[model samples]
Target: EEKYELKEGQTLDVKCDYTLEKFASSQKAWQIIRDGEMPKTLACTERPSKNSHPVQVGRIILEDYHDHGLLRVRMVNLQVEDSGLYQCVIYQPPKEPHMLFDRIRLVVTK
Candidate 1:
């Protein structure tokens, strides 16, 4: 993951990609916004692929993965509060359970 820098009042278009290993099960991706210690979930989408659920802050769009991978998440309407470490979470059946795929740090400046 890379660090993203943005100015205040400016918006960004974020595209998150995920790669699943062998024997891995289903996964869910979420974009979370953090303000100080308070955190707000912007979007949540499940995979292998389905209709996305609407969110208040932003919208989640899921795309179909062919032989490339399993899932991906796209989030829009990014604000200043969207700054933080956006994490990709994966849930593998009854084994290791939940896992964090990746984390990207977003920096918002004025």
Candidate 2:
């Protein structure tokens, strides 16, 4: 697990590596969870195809650097409600999704 502290209006950038052989051609995602709300998908890549591109889901930007073994999550103008645990997970339809990369606990303070 990793931790980050930042001010309420600052940007957040979290990077995790998910470059395992088993993850090839599999669906990858970042999920966020706080106290009361259910877990939510911040960003996710469609099972990578011959070509893939960066995408923004909600307020988060998903950048996949597959060749570099990195997946970067970027969000700007955060608030206290953003404090939570963020996980990089991979889904293999036949089985339950697993968190194979990094887990981050981020706090946005006043």
Candidate 3:
């Protein structure tokens, strides 16, 4: 697990990378973006960016990257609303699950 800290009014850029096996789906690799003082699931998907609700700033697709089994995402224009714990989960195509990586404490200070 890793930690990222930022001050109020500051911006942040988040990035991630991973490798996958053949004939395997890495669709479960997702980013849960949230701010403190609230309990909710912001957004979930396999794409690089989502504009609705919990916005996703960047994403990397294997096909788009010359089938280079890689996954990447970025969160930009950060604000106080972008505080809290951000977790990255990599799931193999199955019912079984594993939390491969996580950022336990992401504090946005004032």
Candidate 4:
């Protein structure tokens, strides 16, 4: 199911109190990425004094719980390169997080 199709400069206001993913190591944080190195991770906690994930300029929010990965994909200014299959990621330390996340795409609209 397509989750969003925001217009250029449009804003997203979603409350994903429950989320999951397979981002990377089990010691990382929640992340949302498109097709590059940039990831929207505005939802990371102090995490590890040096393990806090950072959200894009102002895109999403990465939480520190099993059901608080509130994301708001903000690619500064929406671009074609910013629209496509987006993957949300999360990591749970002390154990290899095996939580599976749903696939979603960001489309441009009028």
Candidate 5:
């Protein structure tokens, strides 16, 4: 009972379109979750410039199009184990993380 399945060896592109909240003490990414986990983190920079570089992680890599106001990621080499519902998570400590934006449901055909 799900939709938007992605096949194996295929490429998936997602834009979390996140931004920093004023309440946050420091600037950080808006995180993407695949089945509620990291090592699966494809979180992205809310703001970036030439002076500093964005940190890359996982098979998941983030892209900063700060010029266009987009926080995005593309994943390749995904397996059936990677298939699940993904959420773009917003973290504010002492508060349960907020996942108020987009959701990705992927089914890998083996």
Candidate 6:
């Protein structure tokens, strides 16, 4: 797993690249598992509503560069509480369980 260390208030960008080519249209997500909490989804590429998008969520930004085989998760104005294990996952066919493809440990210092 990749690792990132940053100070509070800084910006963090974590990019996950995939080798497969035909997964561009598939749904993707960025999830986080803190020290003692269950996994939580930060953002995803799914279109929640007819006109709603999934680009940004609070201070977190989810970018799907699926056209180029990449998914990027960006966090701005970081805080120490943001430290956790982050994962990049893609949903399987028939809306099956998501498979973890990449991960990183992030540590934000005060």
Model 3 alpha-carbon drift over 4 Å, by segment: 22-24, 29-41, 47-69, 91-97
lDDT string for model 1 (7-56, tens) is 76655555444554541235454545365733344544444434233322
RMSD of 6: 3.7
TM-score for each candidate, following the candidate numbering: 0.54, 0.79, 0.49, 0.45, 0.60, 0.78
Which lDDT tens digits does candidate 5 get at residues 1-110?
Answer: 22556778887777655453421222234443543465243454343222134445666655555445455566677788777766655444466666646666777787
What TM-score does model 3 achieve against the real structure?
0.49
Sorted by TM-score, highest first, which candidate order results?
2, 6, 5, 1, 3, 4
Reference-based lDDT, each prediction: 0.51, 0.73, 0.44, 0.45, 0.54, 0.73
Q: Which candidate has the highest TM-score of all?
A: 2
Clashing pairs in 4: 41-55, 42-55, 42-61, 42-62, 43-61, 43-62, 59-72, 59-74, 60-72
Tell me the tens digit of each residue's lDDT in model 3 across 1-110.
Answer: 46778886555555444444531244434445455533233334443322222335243221212144443444444566566666555544355434445455566766
How many steric overlaps are in each model, in order?
0, 0, 1, 9, 0, 0
Displacement of the residue 23 alpha carbon in candidate 6, Å: 1.3
The stretch of ten residues in a row with the least summed lDDT in candidate 2 is 47-56
Who is ahead in TM-score, 3 or 6?
Answer: 6
Error of 5 at 39 (Å): 12
Q: Compute the lDDT of residue 35 as modeled in candidate 5.
A: 38
The local lDDT score (0 to 100) that residue 73 gets in candidate 5 is: 62
